């Protein structure tokens, strides 16, 4: 069986256009493993927005910019004033939650069984823990991180993580698809609320 599998697959290889092809140059996969990632950097993680109820999801991921106390406990004092006064920031956070909800539906459709265990490149919780310990984050003090900075930074990051290169619409559908699960994990992990009351990064 081993020999048969080798002789059947031996010449399949990742090409410089990032497709997987055989000796004949026929396309076996447009991206390796459907995501264009190697198997020895990925690792087990949990999708935080898959299993929770609507109501737990709402409570854990929707940034509450109405509770003035609570923001006072989580954020610094100019941060609190900006979050409470500005309505552009509030609507940025509102549609942040709106795609975490759309992403939740997409995950639900992808994982019809409620299994949040997934294999993804970057262990975001471990990286957040590393950042907490590297910069000596005090979980008990209010943070100096603006939630709008979280939203903006997470989108610039998402734009920078490229599996499929190209500005044409086909290359953007393929790029959206290749990093869809990782971008969902990233938006649900680097959420403004989680980074404000769970992680307290600066």
């Amino acid at each position: 069986i081993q020999r048969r599998l080798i002789k059947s697959m031996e010449s399949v290889m990742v090409k410089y256009d990032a497709t997987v092809r055989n000796s004949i140059n026929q396309v076996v996969q447009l991206r390796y493993g459907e995501d264009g990632l190697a198997g020895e950097s990925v690792e087990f993680q949990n999708l935080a927005t898959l299993k929770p109820s609507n109501k737990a999801f709402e409570k854990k991921f929707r940034f509450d910019y109405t509770n003035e106390r609570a923001l006072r406990r989580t954020l610094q004092e100019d941060l609190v004033k900006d979050v409470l006064s500005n309505a552009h920031i509030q609507n940025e956070l509102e549609r942040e939650f709106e795609r975490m909800r759309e992403d939740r539906e997409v995950l639900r459709v992808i994982f019809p069984t409620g299994d949040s265990k997934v294999v993804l490149p970057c262990n975001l919780l471990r990286m957040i823990w590393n950042a907490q310990k590297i910069f000596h984050i005090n979980p008990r003090l209010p943070s100096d991180l603006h939630p709008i900075k979280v939203v903006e930074g997470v989108k610039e990051l998402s734009k920078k993580l490229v599996i499929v290169n190209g500005d044409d619409p086909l290359s953007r559908q393929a790029q959206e698809n290749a990093t869809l699960l990782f971008n969902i994990h990233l938006r649900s992990t680097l959420c403004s609320r989680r980074m404000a009351e769970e992680f307290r990064l600066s």
Binding site: G39, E40, S41, E43, W129, K133, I134
Partner: protein, 151 residues
């Protein structure tokens, strides 16, 4: 038999480059028989090392900065713990949570979650073994272990 092939093997096939396998995104080599039984016995809560024993063990650390750590117990005797020396073995500033194989399943719910009576619930934090007994689950070939996280 050539510098070409020597560089090829040095940059592709060397054992440290081979620690994590693409087959199952996890280490392919881990800590094995005597070292694993002994690290289980070493990271138990009641392992106390004397000054001379600690120096003898520090002779065998290649990645030692030459600074003897402050013992966990200073009086009536200076005593280092096995976790305190494994903390010196642990590289970098890695962070890791595991559970010893004897970890009771009903301990994570009740009190004493973060202060384990049985010294299960491995916690490595800034490269120091804060607590827990190391075993196959922490130093073996499974995913998320200390060797994997180190790699």
């Amino acid at each position: 038999q050539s510098l070409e092939t020597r560089a090829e093997i040095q940059e592709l096939a060397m054992v440290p480059r081979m620690i994590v396998t693409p087959q199952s995104n996890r280490p392919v080599m881990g800590i094995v028989q005597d070292t694993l039984t002994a690290v289980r016995k070493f990271t138990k809560r009641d392992v106390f090392l004397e000054r001379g024993e600690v120096m003898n063990l520090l002779m065998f650390l290649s990645t030692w900065d030459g600074k003897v750590p402050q013992p966990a117990i200073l009086k009536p005797r200076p005593l280092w713990t096995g976790k305190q020396i494994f903390s010196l073995i642990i590289p970098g500033h890695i962070n890791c949570i595991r559970t010893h194989s004897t970890h009771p399943d009903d301990e994570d719910s009740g009190p004493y979650k973060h202060i384990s009576p049985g010294d299960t619930k491995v916690v490595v934090e800034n490269g120091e073994l804060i607590m827990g007994i190391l075993c196959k689950k922490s130093l073996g070939t499974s995913a998320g272990s200390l060797v994997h996280i180190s790699y």
